[PDB]
RNA sequence: AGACUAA
């Protein structure tokens, strides 16, 4: 037993055994990552199991260094500094830095037991991470535990919660404002406002600030220096992006959630070509989750979600399942398996088996064109695919003229580094390359021969 | 778009 706050003393023998896959799908703020976790590390350690403690994003790993502080755990995330004995058997990292070692030339160390906090992750190298760790499990390698508020199959947007909260549906604006939205600055408490974008945070931010409001920004650009004020300072509002979606803490009186996002699609309308969709819904666990951020505190009575719209259910046409499959057919255990994914995400979209393994060289350019290329799975599979050596960007050059890309109605144009001036016109459309101006010069540096 | 930055 235990008391709230502390760790139990009595941990199941049951979640330690090989081919025993665990999803504790406790409601929001039940104690999963700060109460139940660290229970399990310490039993863990006594069983001398080497371990893996995985995080969505920076922000989950940072409040799982709160609850794990003191243990000797080898924190493998800038979000946590920390003296590395390099005799720990517990390892900690973020979910896609473990698919990206998965990828990678260096060897993973062979788990005897996995722990995914938020497994319900739809980044695809989460998605294939779930895929690796599963196959592991049913392979008797190892035992795992996904811990998520919000499993696989989750259609609810407002789960159980410690205290009440206020459901409100209210107009959310998404660009600053002049008049109208009083409710929003009248509010006493603190707010926690979702955006689709940095941009579209910066906007609102901006608006905010010049209300009299304190606000702090959130975003993965910001994190590192943003992250303690919303701990240790008070506040007014985080506006932030999806980094804080899960695991945050933030002790706020109040979510506004516009419910709405910006998603990769796949097109096959014709040359297959990635689009950005939307502002779409978001997916009812993505609601539930920024909903769950709130009512956290059981001796804080009134807090209030305000969100706009229905969630929408289906995300099929979402790249990242295709993107996932990319990633895990060329991810090998050590006795030579590929793995499938994990059971609740198969046939999510309808891929053969096996179908973007690729050989050799090519395995070795996808993972540069993602690591140091900063290119999606997608293009990074297009590319790789297609025979293309990662310093080789003829491809940039040479797609139809459907392809030209324009920046301010003009033909984006791009030196070389051997001083040639050719037109961006690449072979393989992806938009998120080119979609927003900062992602666009990052891909004109990338054709240039700059990265 | 958002997230990740390890060995
Ligand atoms: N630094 C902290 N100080 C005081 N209370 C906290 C702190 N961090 C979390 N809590 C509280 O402890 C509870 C458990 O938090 P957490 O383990 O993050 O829940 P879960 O991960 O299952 O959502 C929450 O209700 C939260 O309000
Ligand atoms: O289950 V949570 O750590 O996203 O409140
Ligand atoms: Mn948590």
Redesign the pocket.
Known sequence: GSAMGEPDYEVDEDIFRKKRLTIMDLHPGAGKTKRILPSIVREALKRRLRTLIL?????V?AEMEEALRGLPI??????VKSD?TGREIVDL?????????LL?????PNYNLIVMDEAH?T????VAARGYISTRVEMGEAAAIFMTATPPGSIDPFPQSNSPIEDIEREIPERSWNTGFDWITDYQGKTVWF???????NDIANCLRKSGKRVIQ????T?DTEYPKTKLTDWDFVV??????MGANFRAGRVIDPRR????VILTDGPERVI?AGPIPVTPASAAQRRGRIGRNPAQEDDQYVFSGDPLKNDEDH??WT?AKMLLDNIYTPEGIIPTLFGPEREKTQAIDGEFRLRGEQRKTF?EL??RG?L??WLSYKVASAGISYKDREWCFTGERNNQILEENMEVEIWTREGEKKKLRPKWLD??VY??P??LKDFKEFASGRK
């Open positions: 995080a969505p994003t920076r922000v790993a080898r924190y493998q995330t800038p979000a590395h990292m973020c979910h896609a830095t473990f698919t990206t070692r990678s030339s260096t060897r993973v992750f980044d695809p190298c989460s955006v689709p974008s940095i941009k579209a945070g959130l975003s993965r650009k994190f932030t992006t999806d980094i804080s979606e996002c910006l998603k990769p950005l790249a990242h993107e993972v993602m690591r900063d999606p799975v938009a998120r979609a927003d900062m992602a």
